Amino acid sequence: PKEPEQLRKLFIGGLSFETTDESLRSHFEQWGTLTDCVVMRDPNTKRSRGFGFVTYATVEEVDAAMNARPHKVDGRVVEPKRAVSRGAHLTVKKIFVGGIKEDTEEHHLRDYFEQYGKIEVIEIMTDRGSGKKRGFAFVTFDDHDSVDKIVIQKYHTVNGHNCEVRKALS
Template structure:
């Protein structure tokens, strides 16, 4: 049987073995999804390939590291590790605290020794720790844009809670509408007392709609408010508007002179420029041009009417050049 498979393989290759460079040239243009499908297919058929894939993936600690968010303020590294040790041996675990105050920042990390333990933990990502529903994801993947957008439609704000209402009571009340991904009562960091509200994130949008439409909204002897939580990522941030120069249609932005539309008028006017850049106003040009000299028809008085000693007419005494002596 093995000889038959070998012979068929040699016939398909025309008796020539494919080099590693040739295989790389064939695999390089393939998309990630195609490569994953290809390796998954051959990994299921050949256990040796599956072991090689597992060995390569386990060699990188990033593939064995979980990011855990939604932790209670009183959750310590010990309680965090105790909640995840059921899936396998933990190589490293820690709750991240503030450097100044030393208090928890509400999230932490878990790194398993075996990648199979990481896979088991991700099969049930939601986990109740210290009365609060926390969520774990693969640390190297982070949170995708799609899941963030979908989360805005699955996250509820619960207001009007009684000070005696705990996170366990909140989760138990809303569990009837569907599986909860994470949720808790909001507690003050300093006093660890309830702030009178909380959040619930369902795994599906349908469960969120059921919780909103449910007319029975009484918890802890109080009427509570249930609505979609405000997501800061979805809020529109208005940018500051600066001064924008106004451009008038039909005019250039430069200060070059433009000819007057009437060709008979011998002057030009300046181009339109922004108001705050305009120079001080200058005296407007004359709407006509003055020739250097004006000519008149020479006046010759009639001697028979004025006589030889007649004086020039009134108003022309200053212009003797134009009269006959």
């Protein structure tokens, strides 16, 4: 019933050194129930390390928090990202979509992937010499969270096809 905690956790970078567990929690509780909220501090000086983590009760709340960016916490714009899963580069805006075969068109990919975020480019790969569809595509979004949401899904079905999707980068 409950989603794995790893999927409900946000890493918040770029914190003001003034931010505390309490101020971070007061801010992010606006988008959901926080089961956990921590500002990372040096073990000796207790001076902030400039980042922390918050854990929501559900994935929908993570989505709501991500949709409410930019977040300005204690006067500083911070950088929320979903906890990882090791992938060679973390934060990217483009994905590889494979197993779409020759019958998949850009509207299939768009109609599906647009619900993950704003699409900027859809590039269906075609053979260099014949122009035949190669069975894969690249979608570029305006934001990395679209990609983070996509790649953590176990399945992707586009045009009846069960696709293999992964982060793509240069």
